[PDB]
Amino acid sequence: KVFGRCELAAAMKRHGLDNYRGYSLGNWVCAAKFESNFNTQATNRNTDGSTDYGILQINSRWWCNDGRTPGSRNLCNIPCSALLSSDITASVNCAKKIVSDGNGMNAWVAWRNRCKGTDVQAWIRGCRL
Numbered sequence: 275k276v277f278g279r280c281e282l283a284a285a286m287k288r289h290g291l292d293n294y295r296g297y298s299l300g301n302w303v304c305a306a307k308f309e310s311n312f313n314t315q316a317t318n319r320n321t322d323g324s325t326d327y328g329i330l331q332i333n334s335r336w337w338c339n340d341g342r343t344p345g346s347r348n349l350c351n352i353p354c355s356a357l358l359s360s361d362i363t364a365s366v367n368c369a370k371k372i373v374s375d376g377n378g379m380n381a382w383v384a385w386r387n388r389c390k391g392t393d394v395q396a397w398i399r400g401c402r403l
Contacts, residue, residue: 275313275314275315275360276311276312276313276314277306277312277314277329278312279303279307279312279397279401280398280400280401280402280403282303282306282312282329282362283299283303283397283398283401283403284401284402284403285362286299286302286303286306286362286366287299287403289362289363289366289367290366290370291366291369291370292403294370294373295373295374295378297373297378297379298394298395299397299398299403300394300395300396300397300398301379301385301389301394302330302369303394303397303398304385304388304389304392304394304397305330305379305382305384305385305389306329306330307397308384308385308387308388308389309326309329309330309331309382309384310328310329310330310331312329313329314328314329314358314359314360314362314365315328315358316328316329316331317358318331320333320335322335323342323343323344324343324346325340325342325343325354327340327354327355327357327358328357328358328359328362328364328365329357329362329365330357330365330369330382331382331384332350332354332357332365332368332369332372334346334354335347336349336372337349337350337352337368337371337372338350338352338353338354338356338357338368339352339353339354340353340354340355349371350364350367350368350371352364352368
């Protein structure tokens, strides 16, 4: 599913991401924009052999099992394929574990490089939330 900007902001807010560990909703929408262009089906291969899955490009190196990432963890206890669903529950629940792991949203290189220190509030501007 390709979400609309405000549609994803509303779904993320409903699943409890607005100011989760102090990260305002605009941070999460901004991250999804530059990770996936709001596409739940986005996948991309990493140099190390791992793969990024879904709206927030969660990595098989630590967070999910894709059956093909040797010497990796499955800390979200999910098949990576669950991160590709039109229902963002597994992506949100896994992102809450990732952002709590000590590095906050810096775990998303795209967040650090494209969202951090920017006017992220712009990403929820005009949305009925």
